[PDB]
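Subject: sequence -> structure tokens, single chain

Hey, anyone have a minute? Need the predicted structure for the following. Not urgent.
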Amino acid sequence: RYKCGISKACPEKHFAFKMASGAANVVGPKICLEDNVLMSGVKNNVGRGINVALANGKTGEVLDTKYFDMWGGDVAPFIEFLKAIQDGTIVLMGTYDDGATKLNDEARRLIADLGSTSITNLGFRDNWVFCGGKGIKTKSPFEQHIKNNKDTNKYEGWPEVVEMEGCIPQKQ
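Reply:
Had a minute. Here:
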């Protein structure tokens, strides 16, 4: 078995990761980095909205985990958290149930600045996983989403879980 349960070993100077969005409003998202589960329902540290894990881009050590209720909460605390992210930080995000309703243009742009392309159009109950960074100079190569579409949804009212795994280049 490889770190995070990924399919193949990461090359040298890379951090392994594996993540999944939540399933409907019943199974929380899961974020694993370098064989350490940062957030999961079993850890009881996930909740409705956007679930965020921050990690040092040089060591891979977890700095913080928080979640922000993008259905029933105020967006101002989430913006304060986003603005405080330091340069070089690895930013892992996953949705649980709804991650879009309370987003505003400012929050979407701050996340787009971390390398996200999906955040701009993220809508009600879309599932999304992302791994970006503060100071990235490209679109992130780690981002997947599944739109909420009644004609194709796996669940009654929500899309299937979206999953992603990969190798994050270690900052030198």
